[PDB]
Each structure stands twice: as structure tokens, then as C-alpha cells.
């Protein structure tokens, strides 16, 4: 599903926000 970190802006390069900035932070 993911890639080997190399030109993969797709919604799969972990944007430290998709599911990291909207779960346990109000």
C-alpha cells in the first residue's frame, strides 16, 4: 500500500496529521 519513501505525496506518506492531529487533542 505504502511506498519506499521516494516521491509518494499520495495520502500515504504519513502526514503526521491524517490520524495524528485529530484524535486525542480536542
Swiss-Prot record:
Domain of life per record: Eukaryota
Posttranslational modification: N-glycosylated.
Location of this chain's protein in the cell: Apical cell membrane; Early endosome membrane; Cell membrane; Recycling endosome membrane
Domain statement: Binds and hydrolyzes ATP via the two cytoplasmic ABC transporter nucleotide-binding domains. The two ATP-binding domains interact with each other, forming a head-to-tail dimer. Normal ATPase activity requires interaction between the two domains. The first ABC transporter nucleotide-binding domain has no ATPase activity by itself.
Assembly mode: Monomer; does not require oligomerization for channel activity. May form oligomers in the membrane. Interacts with SLC26A3, SLC26A6 and NHERF1. Interacts with SHANK2. Interacts with MYO6. Interacts (via C-terminus) with GOPC (via PDZ domain); this promotes CFTR internalization and thereby decreases channel activity. Interacts with SLC4A7 through NHERF1. Found in a complex with MYO5B and RAB11A. Interacts with ANO1. Interacts with SLC26A8. Interacts with AHCYL1; the interaction increases CFTR activity. Interacts with CSE1L.
Function recorded in the entry: Epithelial ion channel that plays an important role in the regulation of epithelial ion and water transport and fluid homeostasis. Mediates the transport of chloride ions across the cell membrane. Possesses an intrinsic ATPase activity and utilizes ATP to gate its channel; the passive flow of anions through the channel is gated by cycles of ATP binding and hydrolysis by the ATP-binding domains. The ion channel is also permeable to HCO(3)(-); selectivity depends on the extracellular chloride concentration.
Family that this chain belongs to: Belongs to the ABC transporter superfamily. ABCC family. CFTR transporter (TC 3.A.1.202) subfamily.
Protein name in UniProt: Cystic fibrosis transmembrane conductance regulator
Natural source organism: Ovis aries (Sheep)
